[PDB]
Amino acid sequence: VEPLIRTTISDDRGEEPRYAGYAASELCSKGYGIEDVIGLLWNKKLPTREESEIIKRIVMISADHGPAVSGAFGSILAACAGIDMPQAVSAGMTMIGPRFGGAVTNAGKYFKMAVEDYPNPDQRVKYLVSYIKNETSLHTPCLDYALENVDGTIGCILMDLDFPVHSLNGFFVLARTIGMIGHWIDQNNQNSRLIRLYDYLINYAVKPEQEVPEK
Amino acid sequence: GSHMVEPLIRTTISDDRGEEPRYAGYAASELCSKGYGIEDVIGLLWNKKLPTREESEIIKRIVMISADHGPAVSGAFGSILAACAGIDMPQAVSAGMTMIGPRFGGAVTNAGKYFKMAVEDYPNDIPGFLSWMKKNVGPVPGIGHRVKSVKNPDQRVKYLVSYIKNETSLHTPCLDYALEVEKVTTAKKGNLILNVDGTIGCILMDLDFPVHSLNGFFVLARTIGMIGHWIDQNNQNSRLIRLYDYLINYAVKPEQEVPEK
Amino acid sequence: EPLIRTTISDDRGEEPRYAGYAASELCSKGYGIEDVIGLLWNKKLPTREESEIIKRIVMISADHGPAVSGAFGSILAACAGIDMPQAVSAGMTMIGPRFGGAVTNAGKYFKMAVEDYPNDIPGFLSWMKKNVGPVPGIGHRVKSVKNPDQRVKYLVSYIKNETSLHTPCLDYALEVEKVTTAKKGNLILNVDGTIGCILMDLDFPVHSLNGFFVLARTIGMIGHWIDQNNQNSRLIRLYDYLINYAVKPEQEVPEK
Amino acid sequence: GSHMVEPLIRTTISDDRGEEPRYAGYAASELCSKGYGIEDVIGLLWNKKLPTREESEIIKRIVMISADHGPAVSGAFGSILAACAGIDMPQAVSAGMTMIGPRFGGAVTNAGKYFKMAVEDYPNDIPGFLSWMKKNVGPVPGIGHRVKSVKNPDQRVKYLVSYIKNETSLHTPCLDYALEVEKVTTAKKGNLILNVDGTIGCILMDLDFPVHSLNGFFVLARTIGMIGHWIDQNNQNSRLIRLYDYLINYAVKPEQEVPEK
Ligand SMILES: CC(=O)SCCNC(=O)CCNC(=O)[C@H](O)C(C)(C)COP(=O)(O)OP(=O)(O)OC[C@H]1O[C@@H](n2cnc3c(N)ncnc32)[C@H](O)[C@@H]1OP(=O)(O)O
Ligand SMILES: CC(=O)SCCNC(=O)CCNC(=O)[C@H](O)C(C)(C)COP(=O)(O)OP(=O)(O)OC[C@H]1O[C@@H](n2cnc3c(N)ncnc32)[C@H](O)[C@@H]1OP(=O)(O)O
Ligand SMILES: [Ca+2]
């Protein structure tokens, strides 16, 4: 039988799943964390302890940015429409792209090009930068070039961690899913009603009323 | 003219109007600096409370254990179909996530609800609980699996139960009840095991987590796997999928001529 | 062993076949979009009367402005630079029990009410409150007895006066509306209720009912995406004065 | 409190504030009463113009021909996967719709854009257009078919081209160029015919529909089929899909013990 799909990251056929060769429960038993599973499933590599400390902080820092932004607001709109959590969160996730979250992969991409082709106050940035430059020994050429914005900081850092270029948006997608789930729960706890924008929030730049011509 | 504005939405969990975003009143930079993790942010945004150490260790294992279960299941396969169709990651994973529901992944909330109801209303009457569920609800949420069974046990379930019993002091009436239900249901049919959704739901009810939050633990964890599958197919440059003809049981109308109007 | 079973369409022959009919031949013989809907959702070519009803349901339901959840979700995605299909998929995800997707249940319960509570609307309303919750097909955020929904009035008048359809479900729902609007003005028979009743009276498959709204409102959601793209609209961020920030006091993180 | 409001959204296509919706200024029920159709509402909402009778006849045919292509293809299959997972219709169809993009449906808009570029840049130079495309794009979008060819024509294409040439007086420069391109490409290899995506994409550019709108015709038409498939699976009470193990090539890492931290 010719297979329909080819997978390289996980095997569910045994007693429990294997993530890049490692048993899920053995990762739990030996003290590994969510950040380690992220490394295994997205990069097929168990992160080093410093890499795991950076992944953890990137996800924590990126988890939510309030209810006003497109991802969270999409989830809220769906929550208020009575849609179930997974589907509501999927609507918020659909907002992630070139304008909402996209500054991470683009920063990473252009600062990598800058390092190769042109080699020669936000408290979260000052925290992240000081953590990676002082509490780790990770070589951060892209970040160092950028130092010579949180999306800029995170994007440079992920290119410097050698994560595949295809994986970079994953950090923002996963992290913001925590906030979007949270917003859905918050609206459900409040028993929020359907949202319908107020008329004065809309500029109805519409055609004048006209009668339909006969045919 | 001006307008008297009434708020459109009300939010209690997060705010970005200050110096940096605040999660249930706490700054993310401070959470990072003081040694907290992803499991702590999950607790703040979903329960508005910093988890205890015992809770954080449980949340971490729930997420790790649930992260992925291969490419054959609806969530992963949906993400893979979209990846092969050349769809960008967030939109591809949204398609996979849309599969999460009563049958696949999204039975956590209702498993917690109904096992808690059973503990309260049928503590010494599992057959009463099962009969009530069959007549009034349908399949018992958190019971059953397409591939795991008495002969092919789910070590993810065995691990979470062993961890709770041995590495914590957590009192678990819902989980203990569900394990007694599993003995009764698996005597009827081997497929009627206590599954991962049922296990997680019971543990989270025993931790008194918000009832609405329960499915969130699966949704979030399995997003890790779905992103992983999208990346995997992109690394392989996988082509557009068309389901093979032999896998489709066609039972279609005969070819027929359109009649004149 | 097969993975799925399918009965509605087949692309293995010379061209795709919809319930056994070739689309080129349906076009050539003067059939329309409404006939293809009937073939793919009911496996039968509609009668001329049925096709005229389907057409009108779709046209009447196509759009209801940018303020409503489906359109606003599509607009939010358009403004975020998301491509059309994925943006409209976000809008479509909003269609459910509160907005747009009460057609199926409205048809299901009004059809049962005709048989089980023929001369007892209070008994039906009591059964629903205990067994279901809000009556699907009743209520609206903006339309009411004081601001009637002319879409509902039009569809009801078209059916009752311009077709020969026997409408026990729709007639029952109209009697229900007299009872509920006497209690509260917002409890009108809404578009979802009207469509659901009409489709049950037409003996359409019960699972198909929400499809008429999902498809029709896809026209509108695509329109809003195109409109925002033509305007080169920017990323939307909800104004802070539209949000009641009932957030926890800013606190210092305690030591572990 | 009172605020000086700036509108959050600007809309030009429809007004819902009155007794019924107004599509590009026209009352929805009056379009119904005066004998207009779905295709007329499509033109009003997507182009802000009531189509001419001939444009209306073309829109109708495009939608009908594009409505479904069987259950094996990504959009329908996504809807079927969600239907089998117990997901409600709108959410299930949304998953299938997510598959629509560069590989599935995208050849319509790509063919339109490039045959329009050829009419403008290579008006009487098909070899130059075909030389540039092979260098900067690869296979010409809208050209080629696996099973169809000169010996076995696509009757939908022959029907549509014949309709627009013999039942309308519409000027079709993009479609005319694509038919001249087909004469050159079919002479090289018989299978390089003008396909249905190429025929539709060219026609839409010739009807002067906005460039942003072209994908709408496939999206809306295939929503008919995706709804159909969801209903079909629900009528059957189909069970959850989980791909059989033999359909997966598990090109996975060797099993190893987790190292100590
Ligand atoms: C991480 C996860 O996804 S774990 C799974 C989460 N889902 C749930 O917990 C929901 C409840 N469980 C179920 O719906 C099912 O067991 C499924 C969908 C998970 C798997 O079932 P399937 O393999 O599709 O089989 P199907 O639904 O036909 O059930 C097989 C038989 O077991 C019975 N059965 C299956 N699950 C249950 C259940 N939870 N309660 C009662 N009876 C059940 C069915 O009635 C059927 O019996 P029959 O032979 O007399 O007809
Ligand atoms: C195209 C469409 O979307 S048409 C609408 C389709 N939806 C339905 O038919 C589902 C049933 N209806 C409903 O859920 C609601 O009427 C909605 C969501 C459409 C609008 O309601 P909202 O404006 O959000 O108001 P809310 O849900 O708070 O209800 C208003 C009041 O009317 C009552 N009410 C509203 N709809 C119903 C109903 N269908 N049955 C019974 N009571 C109802 C509520 O109980 C509430 O009463 P209260 O003031 O005593 O508490
Ligand atoms: Ca006039």
From TrEMBL, chain A:
GO cellular component terms attached to this protein's record: cytosol
Keywords: Calcium, Cytoplasm, Lipid biosynthesis, Lipid metabolism, Lyase, Metal-binding, Phosphoprotein
Residues that, per the record, bind Ca(2+): 210-211
Main location: cytoplasm
Coiled coil ranges: none
GO term, biological process aspect, one: tricarboxylic acid cycle
UniProt-annotated binding residues for (S)-malate: 65, 124, 176, 196
Full protein name: ATP-citrate lyase alpha-subunit
Subcellular location: Cytoplasm
Binding site for acetyl-CoA 1: 99, 101, 149, 193
